[PDB]
Amino acid sequence: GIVEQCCTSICSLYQLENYCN
């Protein structure tokens, strides 16, 4: 999930937009 994508691994601000409502 987001923790694996962005914290454990790294992610772009574009990837973060995946979790916008």
Partner 1 sequence: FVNQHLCGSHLVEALYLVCGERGFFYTPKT
List contacts with partner 1 (CB under 8 A).
1-4, 6-7, 10-14, 16-17, 19-21
Tell me how far, at minimum, the Cβ of 13 lies from partner 1, in Å: 5
Instruction: Give the total residue count for the chain.
Output: 21
The separation between the first and the last C-alpha atoms of the chain, rounded to the nearest angstrom, is: 16
Tell me how far, at minimum, the Cβ of 12 lies from partner 1, in Å: 5
Q: Is residue 4 within 8 Å of residue 18, measured between CB atoms?
A: no
Tell me how far, at minimum, the Cβ of 3 lies from partner 1, in Å: 4
